[PDB]
Every structure is written in C-alpha cells, then in structure tokens.
Write a protein that binds this DNA or RNA. Structure first.
Ligand code: UXM
Ligand code: ZN
Ligand code: ZN
Length: 842
DNA sequence: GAGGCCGCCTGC
DNA sequence: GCAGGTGGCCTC
C-alpha cells in the first residue's frame, strides 16, 4: 500500500533516502504539496511541501514536511483569504502514514506590471478573494507579524535531493545567534587573544566600540549616594485641604525610574581561556575594554550633561573584563582632533557615533589630553503626504534624506498654509482626498485650482495619518460602524496606496489604532495591503525613545512593494521611562512585538524638559509678541540642534494663551516642586487682576469613603458624595480658587491627577495636545516655574520641531498645528530604516 | 468664543 | 483600585 519507487539514492546510518513514493493510488516526488490531519479532527487540515523522503530502520517510512501557515493563523485571522497560505520557517520529519492527500498549491508571483495593476474598489480590497486553488504569495514571521517576499535561498549540490528552505534558514539563524571567534592574534600564558569576533551578525575587531549594559562595570568615581525624599511631611490640612488626595507617590512625567544608558567601551583584548592542553575554550569568549566616561559619570554629576553633546565621551585608562555575550551592539568612538570632517558632520553622518576630546582621571578628578595610544548620493523618493498637517512627518522624512514631498493633502487651511511656508515647490491640495482620487481615476490632469494631479508612477512613497472618527471604540463592529469604516479616510488612504502602488507606504496613527474594534481596523488594513500584494507589518513606537522629552506612543503600519525590502522598526536611541514604553500589541489573544531589541537600556541619555526649553526667555501669561530676542546662545545639545547652524536673531512663536484672571491666580498658586497640581492649591480668598474675588471652597457633605480632615472638617462638596443621593444644585460653588468640579467628581477620576500640573525640569512632557488646557484631559501644561501655560514654541520643542519651522494662523491654530503633528525625530528614525532598505535593494 | 464640567473602557 | 486614552458639550 505504501511502496518506494526505485532504489535508494543515499543511505546514511539508519536512514535510506528515495526520490519518489507510492501511496494507494498516488505517486509523490520531492517538491509536491500534501495534507495532514491533526489529532483534533475539528481543526482544519495542515498543508506542507514535501522536501525529503526516506526510511528509518527502526520506525519506518518518513518524509520531511515544510509546513505552510493558514492565513487565519496569521494576524489577519478570519479576514484572510480562505485559500491563502503563507510560507513560514516551520518544519518536521513525520511518518508517511500521516499524509492524507496531495494538494495543488500555486505560488502567486506579482507580475512585472504589478505597479500598474491597481484600481480595485474598497470592497475588492477588504473582502475580495482570489478564487482559485490553494495559493501563497508571502512569507510570514509570527513573532513580529511581518509579511515579506519569499526568500530565494539556493539548493546545495550535495544537499539538493533533501533540501529544505526552513531547515537551511533555521541553521543560518542559529549560527548567527551563537558568538564565535575569528583570526587568532596571539597565544598568551593564561589566555589566547584574537583580532576579531562575531555576534548576532556584527563583526567586532580590536579597537571597535561596544555597547554594554549599565551593570557590566562601574567607574572608579564614587557614585555619591543621593537621598530619596523622606516621608511626605504633614501639611496644614485646613489650608491645603485637597492635599490628602496625593497619597500616591507616583509622579507623572518623572524620570526617577528611567534606566541608565549603555556603558561604552573600546575593545582592548578579545580573548578566550585556554584549556589545560593549551587549546582555547572558544565557548567562553571574554573581552577587555577601556571604560569611557559620559560627562554625567565624572565627579561632576548629572549637571555635566546639561551642556554637553549627547554623544560626548571622556577617554579613561580604567579597564574592565566582561563576557562577549554581554555586548549589546557595536559603536564607533573617535578622537575628535584626528577626525577628517568636523565633529558635527561626523555625528550627523551615521548611527552609533561617539567622540572624545579630553581624557578623565578619576583619581585626580581632572581633564587632560588622551594618550597617543588612543588614536588610530542616491535620489530621493517622490512622496505624497496625505493628512499632512503642517508637515512634521514630511520634515522628519526629509531629514532622513529619503523623500521630497511633492504632493500634500491637507483639508485644514491654516495647516496647509504652514506646510506651504515650509515646503515651497510642493503642491498642497486642500480638497477631500476622495474627490482628488476620483478626479485622477476619471482621467483628470489638474484640479479646480489648476494644480497638477499626481499620476501613476509619480508617487514613489505614500505616507499619512488618517483620522478614525466614528469607529475609535473598542467594541465590536456592527453594520453601522462597519459602513462608517468602509467609507472612511483610512480606507481612502488604502485606496490611494492601491492605486499609486508606491515603493514604500506608512500609516501613522494613535497607539490604540491597533486595538480599535477588537483590533479589526488593524486587521483589515493589513488584509488590504496583502490583497494589494504588499509586504507589510505593524508596531508601536514611543516618540520619547527617539529624542523628544515627551511621551507619545504612536501606531505604525509599514508596507513595501514586491521587489523591495520591508523596513525594520527603528531601535530606540534614548532611554525613557519604562512605563511609557509598553509597545506590545495583543490581537486575538496573541501577543505581537516589533523587531526592537533595546528593551532595558540605550545609547543616549533621556531628553528632559530642561534640554527642551531651558534657553527660552521668561514671558507672561498671554504673551503675544511674535518675534522676541533669545537673550542668549543655546544651552543644551537639543537646543543647539533645533536652533540650527545659521545664527537666528529672532525667536518666533514664543507666545502663550491669555488665561482668565481666575485661571491665572490658580496657576500662580501651584507650587514649583515636582509633582505639583491643583491638589496643592491653598483654600484662600484672593483678589484677581480684574478686581473680582476668588472665594474659599467650603466643605458641605460627609464623604464616608475619604473621611474627614485632621481638623475634623468634611471632605465632600456635594450631596452626591452620599450613597445614591444626586447633585443638589445649591451645593455647586462658583469662583473658588480650588475648582469645585475636581473634588466633585475626583473620587472616580483618580483625583484628577495632573490637572493644573507643572512640568518638571528633569522630567518630560505628557502627550503634546492641540490645545493646552489646565483643566482638560491632559492638564499638565503649566511651566516649571513661570505662572503660565506652556508656550507654542515650547510645545514645538516638545515635538522636536526646528525653531525655523514656520507655523501659520492665530495662537490656537499654531498650538493645533504642533499638537497634530508627528514628531520629526520619530519620523526621521522611521525614514532612516526606509533608507536602509533603499540602499540594500537588489 | 471661552470656561466649567466630566463617561466609559482597558491593562495591570 | 490605579493609571492611561480618547474631547466634546452646555452655557453665557
Ligand atoms: C478625561 C476627560 C474626558 C474625556 C477626555 N479626554 C472624554 S473624551 C470622549 C467625549 N468627550 O465624547 C470621546 C470619546 C471618543 C472619541 C472622542 C472623544 N470624555 C469625558 N466624558 C465626559 C462626559 C461626556 N459626555 C463624555 C465622557 C471625559 C471626562 N470626564
Ligand atoms: Zn526542514
Ligand atoms: Zn454632586
């Protein structure tokens, strides 16, 4: 019933291989695809390509199965084409008895004309199926949710009869995962030194720079012990009655829990211990490095980093021995005086670049010169930016050097004007993108303004952030919400992608884009891209990890045309508060992460509010002067970068809103200490600038949950503080310095922590929003010391805008332009990944 | 036009 | 229970 076809081609040990076999009516050669029934008959069939056939002398006839992955098993889930399979690196040997049948599985290769085949309607993108036999077009990575073009690994001349792409690639992966040694330098008594070694695909030579975790070594400088603030001192509970609502010690925006950045070492010796016979123990690779001092690591503590470049190091003669496995990555560390180009052109010329000028001696606590033994393009993509705003994303991409935004669609006119101001020679459309795409599809050349419409082939990269009004909830889709989504700007954007078929595609959105409607918006977006034939993936980035003093998690969908390389997500550059760095995403109770490997540390120190705005001159509440004096040079590396090279005699848009007299009193009665907000307000009468009065907040009801003051006073300001009693309108009080509504509903809003909250110089911004309001959602918008709301220029700094980036409109328009924008440092990191792909194209 | 006011859901 | 994430709507 099961019989071989011929004699054996190769017999090794207990196995004997054959090329063709016969099962009960059928003949199978290596290369055919088959089906296998799981032990659970309710689960669907498994499908695999046979890669080898043989017989084991103690178990019987065997074959090697390289499994396919059903589309429902990918992140696409139920939205997958019911007949679409995906190549995966999964395989196993299995008895031929498990084979159920032979199935036809076709490879649907994109045509040479793929770029012109777009134009299918949203319904055909969302729900259209292929309508043929089993087919695959893409390889799938399950831990990163990456759909990519199938690998082109070639078969051996000695291992062709039994070759398996999956086995070959898994062996490649393991062999690059294990660290090895290379050209052997010199034999010593106790160890043997090498000139080079390799780890995770990176080549480390003697003299290269290594990233190490902060635990890898310590410095000879005594890390002088700071003092955590003693227990919260008791305050006058009748003067600051709401202070009791600060029983949590957690400070929003604080960097007290932010990790330390990497240690930087220079490889002095790569070496292995010798076995007693003299041969090296090459499974135990050690390295000897010279400790580099960051400025903040010298006897001058943290303040030494306020002015220094973020990549400035101090050479030292201290040394350390660590395990090679501890190396977190390679980096360049150059002596500045020997550098061919200037220090700025160097630092801006590539990743992981550090330089040193002086040398640090901890024993002497002095800076001297380092010993002598310490010495030794391509065309931009034409880009269409949909829902551009003032152009933060386009600016970041331009800074990466990959894009010229030739076309932008922005319906809000002041943001369109700002994008024009910053991007002359780009065509900015203010029409509905649906109207534009329909005009293009109808054969139109120009819009009603005379502007030339982008045609197929003009658009080489497509990026944008589409709003998600109507379906931004978590509840499941119904008919109404699904219709609103099918007629949505997200789907319109995908239609743009399908029509123009650019080389690269980026959808940016709020973090929760990945969870909307039980992750259905995400799943349908990926489904559309796959239906177009794109390679694609998704992930969540934290903008603060790329060089801004702000927590801003954004969702990122990346797509790359067939023939391209699918970009990686950018590795974090700066350490950041870990609680602001939850980037994982759960889809159908499966956890996906990105390719990011820097989880606990990083190469650059975190950017603080001090780095962001310590150089801006003091202004009053309601500052309106559009052009003022900086009153001095930039102070931090970040300020030098954003102010730029050419000297700027004018500081622009350092204006603030003119909050009312009551709000101004409140603000100037918020303490300057970190973590201060409305709960530290005093309960006093105060006369306002308009001569009116602000009265005490009187406590009129017993909150049995929160109790009473140390003086015995009540803590409720309304009858609703009782069990089921409703709001007595007479209990509402007006023109109180302590706003009445915050104690009124604070028990169910985490005591409205952060409202009327000050920023911290050592800390970061909460998410920069379109209109900073101290009693709104994100109400931590007060200046660290000045009695005002954060300014437009300060918000721009928190978003990482260059100071020369022109805005447009009134102050609320400009706040909104800044708030809506993608932080250019984040956009630039993504763009550099895209550039990697552009450079590494076959 | 600007300020007071403040639900519902999720991950832990 | 705590922290985070989403602005909009009466009202004068
Ligand atoms: C934290 C303060 C707050 C916010 C905020 N940020 C909202 S955003 C909500 C809406 N406003 O529609 C919305 C939902 C979906 C999309 C866009 C906006 N909503 C709040 N609620 C007050 C009573 C209102 N009827 C609605 C619920 C509160 C509070 N407190
Ligand atoms: Zn295999
Ligand atoms: Zn009430």
């Amino acid at each position: 019933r099961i019989s071989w076809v011929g004699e054996a081609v190769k017999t090794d040990g207990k196995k004997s291989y054959y090329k063709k076999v016969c099962i009960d009516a059928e003949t199978l050669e290596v290369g055919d695809c088959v089906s296998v029934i799981p032990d659970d008959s309710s689960k669907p069939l498994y499908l695999a390509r046979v890669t080898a056939l043989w017989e084991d002398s103690s178990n019987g006839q065997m074959f090697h199965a390289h499994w396919f992955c059903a589309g429902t098993d990918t992140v696409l889930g139920a939205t997958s084409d019911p007949l679409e399979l995906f190549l995966v690196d999964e395989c196993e040997d299995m008895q031929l008895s498990y084979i159920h049948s032979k199935v036809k599985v076709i490879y649907k290769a994109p045509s040479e004309n793929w770029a012109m085949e777009g134009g299918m309607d949203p319904e055909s993108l969302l729900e259209g199926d292929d309508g043929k036999t089993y087919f695959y077009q893409l390889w799938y990575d399950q831990d990163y949710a990456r759909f990519e073009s199938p690998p082109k690994t070639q078969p051996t001349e000695d291992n062709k009869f039994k070759f398996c792409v999956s086995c070959a690639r898994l062996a490649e992966m393991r062999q690059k995962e294990i660290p090895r040694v290379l050209e052997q330098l010199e034999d010593l008594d106790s160890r043997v030194l090498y000139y080079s070694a390799t780890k995770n695909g990176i080549l480390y030579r003697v003299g290269d720079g290594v990233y190490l975790p902060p635990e890898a070594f310590t410095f000879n400088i005594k890390l002088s012990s700071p003092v955590k603030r003693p227990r919260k001192e008791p305050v006058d509970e009748d003067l600051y009655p709401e202070h009791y609502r600060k029983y949590s010690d957690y400070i929003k925006g604080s960097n007290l829990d932010a990790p330390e950045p990497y240690r930087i070492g220079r490889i002095k010796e790569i070496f292995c211990p010798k076995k007693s016979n003299g041969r090296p123990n090459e499974t135990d690779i050690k390295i000897r490095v010279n400790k580099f001092y960051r400025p903040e690591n010298t006897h001058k503590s943290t303040p030494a980093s306020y002015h220094a470049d973020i990549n400035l190091l101090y050479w030292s003669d201290e040394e350390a021995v660590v395990d090679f496995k501890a190396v977190q990555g390679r980096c360049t560390v150059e002596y500045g005086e020997d550098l061919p180009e200037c220090v700025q052109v160097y630092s801006m010329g590539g990743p992981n670049r550090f330089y040193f000028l002086e040398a640090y001696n901890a024993k002497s606590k002095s800076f001297e010169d380092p010993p002598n033994h310490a010495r030794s393009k391509l065309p931009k993509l034409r880009t269409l930016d949909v829902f551009s705003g003032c152009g933060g994303l386009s600016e970041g991409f331009h800074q990466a050097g990959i894009s010229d935004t030739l076309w932008a669609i922005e319906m809000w006119d002041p943001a369109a004007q700002a994008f024009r101001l910053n991007n002359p020679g780009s065509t900015v459309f203010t029409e509905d993108c649906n109207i534009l795409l329909k005009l293009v599809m109808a054969g139109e050349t120009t819009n009603s303004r005379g502007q030339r419409l982008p045609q197929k082939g003009d658009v080489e990269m497509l990026c944008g952030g589409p709003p998600c009004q109507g379906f931004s909830g978590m509840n499941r889709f119904n008919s109404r919400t699904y219709s609103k989504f099918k007629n949505s700007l997200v789907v319109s954007f995908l239609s743009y992608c399908d029509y123009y078929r650019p080389r690269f595609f980026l959808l940016e959105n709020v973090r929760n884009f990945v969870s909307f409607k039980r992750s259905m918006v995400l799943k349908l977006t990926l489904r559309c891209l796959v239906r177009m034939g794109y390679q694609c993936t998704f992930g969540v980035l934290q903008a603060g990890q790329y060089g801004v003093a702000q927590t801003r998690r954004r969702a990122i969908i990346l797509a790359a045309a067939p023939g391209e390389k699918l970009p990686l997500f950018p590795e974090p550059l700066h350490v950041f508060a870990p609680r602001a760095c939850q980037l994982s995403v759960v889809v159908d109770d499966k956890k996906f992460v990105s390719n990011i490997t820097r989880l606990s540390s990083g190469p650059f120190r975190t950017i603080t509010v001090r780095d962001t705005m310590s150089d801006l001159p003091e202004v009053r509440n309601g500052a309106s002067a559009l052009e003022i004096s900086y009153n001095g040079e930039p102070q931090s590396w970040f300020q030098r970068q954003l102010r730029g090279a050419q000297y700027q005699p004018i500081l622009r848009d350092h204006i603030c809103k003119d909050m009312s007299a009551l709000v101004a009193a409140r603000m100037r009665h918020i303490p300057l200490a970190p973590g201060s907000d409305w709960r530290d307000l005093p309960n006093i009468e105060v006369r306002l600038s308009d001569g009116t009065m602000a009265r005490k907040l009187r406590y009129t009801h017993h909150d049995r949950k929160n109790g009473r003051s140390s003086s015995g006073a009540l803590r409720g300001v309304c009858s609703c503080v009782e069990a089921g009693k409703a709001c007595d309108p007479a209990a509402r009080q007006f023109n109180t310095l302590i706003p009445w509504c915050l104690p009124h509903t604070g028990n169910r809003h985490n005591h409205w922590a952060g409202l009327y909250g000050r920023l911290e110089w050592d800390g970061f911004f909460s998410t920069t929003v379109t209109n900073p309001e101290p009693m709104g959602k994100q109400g931590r918008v007060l200046h660290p010391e000045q009695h005002r709301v954060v300014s437009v220029r300060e918000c721009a700094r928190s978003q990482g805008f260059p100071d020369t980036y022109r805005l447009f409109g009134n102050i609320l328009d400009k706040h909104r332009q800044v708030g809506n924008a993608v932080p250019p440092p984040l956009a630039k990191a993504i763009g550099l990944e895209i550039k990697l792909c552009m450079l590494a194209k076959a």
